[PDB]
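Q: multiple PDZ domain protein, please. Structure only.
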Amino acid sequence: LRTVEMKKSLGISIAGGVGSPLGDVPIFIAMMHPTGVAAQTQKLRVGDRIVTICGTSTEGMTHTQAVNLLKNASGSIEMQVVAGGDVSETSV
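A: Structure for multiple PDZ domain protein:
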């Protein structure tokens, strides 16, 4: 579990959520802009699953809900993540 505080775009591409094309899966980081704010933290990784955003659980969030929250936010944006662990995919 890692907790990150970012100030803004965040420079991440998020995927997953309730009702995703693969069913209800945790929100996750699918890509990251190489020079963006997320990259600059050196604490987020592609494949991280997002457990909380702006101090609230992602349990039950759809992809649209999570994206709208992140797009709308400014100031300090808290995120907590867990590593994907190569559990549901494999890094090559």
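A: Brief note, in case it's useful. The helical segments are 37-41, 63-72.
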